[PDB]
Amino acid sequence: RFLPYLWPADNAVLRRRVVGAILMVLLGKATTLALPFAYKKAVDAMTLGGGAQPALTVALAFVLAYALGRFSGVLFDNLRNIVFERVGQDATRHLAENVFARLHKLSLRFHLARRTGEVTKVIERGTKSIDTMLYFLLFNIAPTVIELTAVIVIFWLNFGLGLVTATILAVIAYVWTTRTITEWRTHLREKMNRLDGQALARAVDSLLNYETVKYFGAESREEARYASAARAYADAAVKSENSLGLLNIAQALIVNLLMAGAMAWTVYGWSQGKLTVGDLVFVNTYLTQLFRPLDMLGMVYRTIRQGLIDMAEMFRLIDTHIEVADVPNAPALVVNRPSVTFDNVVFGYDRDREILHGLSFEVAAGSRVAIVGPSGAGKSTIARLLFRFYDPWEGRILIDGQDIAHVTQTSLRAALGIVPQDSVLFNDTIGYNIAYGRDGASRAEVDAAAKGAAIADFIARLPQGYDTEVGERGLKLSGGEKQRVAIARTLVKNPPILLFDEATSALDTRTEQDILSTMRAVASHRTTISIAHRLSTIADSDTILVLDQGRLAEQGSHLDLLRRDGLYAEMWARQAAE
Amino acid sequence: WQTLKRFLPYLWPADNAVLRRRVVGAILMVLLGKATTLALPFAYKKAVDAMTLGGGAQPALTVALAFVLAYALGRFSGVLFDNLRNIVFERVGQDATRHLAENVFARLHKLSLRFHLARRTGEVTKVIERGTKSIDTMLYFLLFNIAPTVIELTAVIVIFWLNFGLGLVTATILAVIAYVWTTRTITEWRTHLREKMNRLDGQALARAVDSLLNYETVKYFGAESREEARYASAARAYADAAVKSENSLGLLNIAQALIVNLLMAGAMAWTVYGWSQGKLTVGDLVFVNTYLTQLFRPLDMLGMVYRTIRQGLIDMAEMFRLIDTHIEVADVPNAPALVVNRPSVTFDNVVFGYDRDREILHGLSFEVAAGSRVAIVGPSGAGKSTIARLLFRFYDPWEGRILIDGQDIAHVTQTSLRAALGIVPQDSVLFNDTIGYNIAYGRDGASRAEVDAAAKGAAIADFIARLPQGYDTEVGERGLKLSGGEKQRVAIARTLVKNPPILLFDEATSALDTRTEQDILSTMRAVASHRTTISIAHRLSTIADSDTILVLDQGRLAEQGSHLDLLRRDGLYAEMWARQAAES
């Protein structure tokens, strides 16, 4: 139940669009009720002839009534479609936009554990389900009931109470058989959807690892592992479509038994002198015009049922994946002095394995602090917690003495600029990626960042320059070039706090020192936290934080830590060993 | 087109199965259904026996039995035969869809590295889905919607010829010709809008998927609304195109209805006039009524059938264009296998660039000796990973050649060449599975002993042991739940499980502390005897103890020699090593 979302629609002229559309339907249905009465002009072709002329009433009245009735029915249906198409496309678009936004609202844990193909299939299928569900609720529930009741009333009036009882019995057995077969088919369809999602997810995962498959020559292995899920889906789909065919034959059996009974009773009434032969075609046309909407209601029920289950699936994917949230009436972060404080932070990604065991440190405002440690000590975890992708179990994190968990995430992330360990670029040009740092960045800012990131000369020597396409995830650039593009993005952003998580690992020391010296020259009060395994990158830092066993082991300058003969001294001795 | 003549050799292996029986049965079912549909109004035309020869006990027997037997049972048998065709053909159809999807996936993995580097994942996904669906529906309509419609059309024409002379048949063929004409005209009117619409849909989905891949980036720069707007733009463009297309379809439907109902009025008016002259009966009225409805019901879909066949043909031609253009490396005719007796590597005057407007390798020549441990260093952009990609033959050089044990890489099967190489790439990507599956991926059917030995060699065995789920820990998409060093060590473990004669580490230990790195390297040097090891690294301490160091600068080999030799020459490597020992 997500009701209030469509209510803004009446702000527009959608009223005028929907009412007329509904109006069209009604008029079309009206002609469909005046179509068999139009066909009892054959009575005037046999019984009593014509009041004025026997063949003139029949010819003229019949051509006009039957032809215009069928044409006007189709015309009103298509007029409804034509006038409602704009509203329908706008509704589908708004649903897709809101789904996309809610998908970007989800937590980092979800996107790290996601499967892109599965998410794609689930989103597509659920959006189609919701769209068709709303369409059927607007155009296939009230008109069908109207036709059903109207045709029942006409049979009541012109044929007593036998035809209506037979018709309601047929309709009730129809809805019962439909429910039974649909409930039988729900399991197969659910399994089929799940298998299709898994198959598409596996295919997309194989696409993401194309270079891996090439590196290990496992093309046939991936082909077979996709064919497995493909064949499972094929079996499930065969079962489901056979179920649908059986439902169709049962529905046809019921409707045609009603047909035989009705026309037999009508001709028996004729043979008893009660009814006319025109009543035969009367009941014929009315039963066909009643068989169309019941065939519509069967698929309407099936579609609403599976649309509800697919909607539940998609929402279950977009529901419970929001860990970090703003506290009620959260204020904005005020960065007067860009300091960072880790106050006894205890954190782990999952409760069964703890990574940070009460970590505490103080990055002074405007300082240039480094973070070292072995692989797995939890440095990138510090980076992720500072950006509040997760909340710590115990302790807290402060920026200028303010708890990040008690401030709006927007203001917190506006004060931070992160160059991640895994740098990912948009499948666009270098200019777009570098300008992405700030919305509406000027060419001057882009050039300044490219010069500060030591890629201005690289971009200048490129045949397409700033318009060079970087490919998916920027893999068409070299590693150092991608890292420098990320640095240029964060420089365009220009926040008070900067965090380089292994930002220059793919750079030669010369280019790295160019970037760092340019930053130290042009920056005045920027705080710069840097993580690196290459100790030469951070030797000239103001302070170095040695992380060990999820805690802070040592802290101090390069010379102090070397003289203290501690853990950092061992690192630098083993790395500076000739 | 000739694409269908070129595509047909693949539906030729399909002919060898029992699916001959299933398709024959399906066609038979169709034919029986059409026969019953034709016979339906023949005996609904026993309303004549109701009025004419009527008013007694015998007429009521003729009529009751006549309609009960023929009309009700006939329409039921028609629907039953339609669904019987569906049920007997469902297996063949699903198998055809599955085989098409498998072949599309295989060909997609057959394309060149350039394509996948420049690809758009969401666009590729949407295009593959739409094209496979279109080809499937095209084949389905060619098999089940061409012969039955022609049969019904000609049969109803013959029946009208017999029971109504030659005026009705001429009117009917005129209506049919104006119907197909209007359909073609409107379809070609909307085709451009449909192509633009499909293109916009693909672009929008590609943009959304790219935003998904950059979730962390969007979060880092707070551009959620920016991505929302950049997706909404293409979404509403697609919406406008779709509105235009569906309105075109609505006009097509009203025009078809106009034609059909004009023919209806004319035919039934002529029938009642013939009745008024004593020529025809009221049964002829109901006759022509049911026959005209049963004749224009299949045409109500051939309009879309033409659209579907056209778009399926163009998508098939697009597929053939994509496979005739996006495979740049191929095996020479009767290519032999690579015989690596002595794992040496040779770059003989290699001139290469990715695009012709920018050359990266300017006549590079070097000799990696068999069993040696050579390093490749240089500034960012010199073309070291380019050397790595050329050695694996992702691209072919413009000039020069590459040799492994004296054999030209371009004159050997790619499978044997790539089997002799094991590379840890600069961009390590893992499958969205467990650590055990990723490490075991190095060799098909690797044993637990090999996986454990490789995890020990990559210095990650202890880490996996201390994990709550051990080898079954999920690494996430692209292995982003592991750390950088852990992911690199998993990649090293993969290449160690593979255990080829030649190994290439392109920045393989950059995210590792020097201790773990030296553990891995010492373990390798201990267990390896005659393995050739090419290593690329900016951190020179990783490669200082190499047998030879190759300095690459702007695509040319500048210096060459041991660590001591290059340090003593006071050249570029000496400058790099002095600047890297910063002692600040």
Ligand SMILES: Nc1ncnc2c1ncn2[C@@H]1O[C@H](COP(=O)(O)OP(=O)(O)NP(=O)(O)O)[C@@H](O)[C@H]1O
């Ligand atoms: N999302 C996650 N789920 C589970 N475990 C995780 C997740 N992210 C990180 N880890 C683990 O947490 C530990 C610390 O990771 P991380 O903070 O990246 O350390 P790191 O040392 O700074 N990166 P590195 O230099 O490459 O070793 C490692 O054992 C990771 O495998």
Ligand SMILES: Nc1ncnc2c1ncn2[C@@H]1O[C@H](COP(=O)(O)OP(=O)(O)NP(=O)(O)O)[C@@H](O)[C@H]1O
């Ligand atoms: N597919 C491609 N299309 C265009 N340019 C490319 C492509 N691949 C690589 N390049 C360029 O080729 C040059 C060198 O690429 P690369 O082989 O990665 O050198 P590299 O030595 O590995 N750089 P790095 O790893 O950062 O130290 C760079 O200018 C790249 O941008």
Ligand SMILES: [Mg+2]
């Ligand atoms: Mg890290």
Ligand SMILES: [Mg+2]
């Ligand atoms: Mg590289």
